[PDB]
């Protein structure tokens, strides 16, 4: 609509005890407030994280057989580069 507006990490983790929330694909934001009712499966969408917090594919099934990832009709912007791990160090959680 205008341009990729990046949101700080505090803006992405601000939704939780309300109703609508977004998700991160390692470098993007996903306003999926409508996905909560756009794809009703087995509560497996917007809740697939465990390996160091990672969401490879969270698209349930039912919408015309195994459909493709709808990563485009539910995105709002990208992740601010100030938090992206590609400036000073790469990673370190040991």
From Swiss-Prot:
GO BP, sorted A to Z: response to cadmium ion
Major localization class: endoplasmic reticulum
Give the record's keywords alphabetically.
Acetylation, Electron transport, Endoplasmic reticulum, Heme, Iron, Membrane, Metal-binding, Microsome, Transmembrane, Transmembrane helix, Transport
Q: What is the protein's membrane topology class? A: Single-pass membrane protein
Task: Give the subcellular location.
Answer: Endoplasmic reticulum membrane; Microsome membrane
State where heme binds.
Answer: 39, 63
What positions are modified (N6-acetyllysine)?
Answer: 2, 5, 14
Give a short account of what the protein does: Cytochrome b5 is a membrane-bound hemoprotein functioning as an electron carrier for several membrane-bound oxygenases.
The protein's name in its UniProt record: Cytochrome b5
Q: Which organism is it from?
A: Rattus norvegicus (Rat)
Placed within the complete protein, the shown segment runs 6 to 99 of 134
């Amino acid at each position: 609509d205008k341009d990729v507006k990046y949101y700080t990490l505090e803006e992405i983790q601000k939704h939780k005890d309300s109703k609508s929330t977004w998700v991160i694909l390692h470098h993007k934001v996903y306003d999926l407030t409508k996905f909560l009712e756009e794809h009703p499966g087995g509560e497996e969408v917007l809740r697939e994280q465990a390996g160091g917090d990672a969401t490879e594919n969270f698209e349930d099934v039912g919408h015309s057989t195994d459909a493709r990832e709808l990563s485009k009709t539910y995105i709002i912007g990208e992740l601010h580069p100030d938090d992206r791990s590609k400036i000073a160090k790469p990673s370190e959680t040991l």
